[PDB]
Amino acid sequence: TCPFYKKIPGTGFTVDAFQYGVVEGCTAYFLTHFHSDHYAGLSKHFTFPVYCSEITGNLLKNKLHVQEQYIHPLPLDTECIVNGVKVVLLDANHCPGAVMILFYLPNGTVILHTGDFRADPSMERSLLADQKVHMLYLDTTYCSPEYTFPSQQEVIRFAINTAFEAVTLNPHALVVCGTYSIGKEKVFLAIADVLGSKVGMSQEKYKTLQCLNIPEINSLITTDMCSSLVHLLPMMQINFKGLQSHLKKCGGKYNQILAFRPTGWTHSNKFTRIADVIPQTKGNISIYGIPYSEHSSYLEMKRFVQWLKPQKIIPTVNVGTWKSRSTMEKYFREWKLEAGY
Ligand code: NI
Predict the structure, then answer these.
(1) Same domain, 157 and 214
(2) Tell me, what is one Gene Ontology molecular-function annotation carried by this entry?
(3) Which of 10, 24, 35, 88 sees the fewest Cβ atoms within 10 Å?
(4) CA 337 / ligand 1 centre spacing (Å)
(5) Which among 92, 5, 104, 7 is positioned nearest to 56, based on CA atoms?
């Protein structure tokens, strides 16, 4: 049965609620982004209206085979009436196609559902600036002060510089990057651009990337592995055994691998600056864990919420333990007392 924090009061609407069967009283199912914990339950047999971004709608139709007649894509930054209620979709600065949803309830209440997001000061100048929000359904993934990581720009700078140095020292090195979902495409695209290579990958991943409206994409990716010196592999294969086995398959073209594992936060963020990061190495194989996050840091989260000044906060992440819930509620009260709302 559908939990309370996925229902929007005073509407027929649910958010990211496809794994509960037919939800009583739901006339429209919103989907914030195409990540599996959120789309869990959708297939070609789904027969209710789904509201989402154009990019999420491309993935629904091509990857999950949802029939076209039940996909309702909405443009961003645009007031739209859905089943008699005004809604707006905003960019969530998460993965491609990810949105936040503003709902303007018939009784005058305004609700923001962030989906998954990486808060940014640029959001303070979206359509959020123009009016008050009463309730915030908040992505609280890293809601604790220990969660620090660098900007995405710093992380990409480190990766480009590392890859370009390695391959310039040894023109016979292969670069490999791990993936298990959409998001974080900048990691492998920026490295392939510095090296003058396309990115090589499986037919299934090429298919997924072709749904994302990235400009000039036919110029950046390929299924011809032999023509590429940046390869994408499943995240599970990014270990010494899996990489050794991949190197065997490349027909003696290469004699070294440099591999990247984009993770979220890891406890080595407590001690080591991005500049100082070092790989794990075994023989002719090196593996870098790089803290490329598509979720808010604690400080980014706090800044957003103190700017928005919501009357009530409903967390959507870390909601299963009393310890987590009590910790989050303590930070929300701190933020409110400090800023004075
Ligand atoms: Ni996500």
Answers:
(1) yes
(2) 5'-3' DNA exonuclease activity
(3) 24
(4) 30
(5) 92
Residue-wise DSSP of 64-117: S---GGGEEE--TT--EEETTEEEEEEE-SSSTT-EEEEEE-TTS-EEEE--S-
In Å, what is the CA distance from 232 to each residue of 34, 259, 305?
A: 20, 10, 37
Task: Kindly give the distance from the C-alpha atom of residue 262 to the centroid of ligand 1, in angstroms, as a whole number.
Answer: 14
Q: How far is CA 128 from CA 6, 74, 124, 149, in A?
A: 21, 18, 7, 26
Q: Residues 223, 204: contact at Cβ < 8 Å?
A: no
**Sheet containing 7-8, strands listed edge to edge, beginning at the edge strand earlier in sequence:** 7-8, 13-15, 28-30, 50-52, 71-73
> How was this entry determined?
X-ray
Ligand 1 mean position, distance from CA 245 (Å): 30
* Token duo for residue 134: 């009463």
Question: From the CA of 297, how far away is ligand 1's center (Å)?
Answer: 15
Written as one letter, the residue type at 102 is L
Please give the distance, rounded to the nearest whole angstrom, from the Cα atom of residue 80 to the centre of ligand 1.
24
Query: Measured in angstroms, how far is the CA atom of residue 166 from the centroid of ligand 1?
Result: 32
The DSSP line for 155-194 is HHHHHHHHHHHHHHH-TTEEEEEEESSS--HHHHHHHHHH
103, 215: one domain: no
Q: Distance from the CA of 33 to the center of ligand 1, in angstroms?
A: 7
- Centre of ligand 1 to C-alpha 294, Å, is 8
Ligand 1 centroid to Cα of residue 16, in Å, is 11
CA dihedral 327, 333, 334, 335 (to 10 degrees): 110
- Ligand 1 center from residue 21 Cα (angstroms): 21
- Together in a domain, 20 and 140: yes
Q: What is the span of the domain harbouring residue 282?
A: 148-295
What's the domain count of the chain? 2
Cα–ligand 1 centroid distance for 116 (angstroms): 5
Q: Looking at the structure, tell me whether residues 105 and 232 fall in a common domain.
A: no
Spatial CA neighbour of 59 closest among 210, 211, 191, 209:
211
Residue positions counted in the chain: 341
Same structural domain, 10 and 130: yes
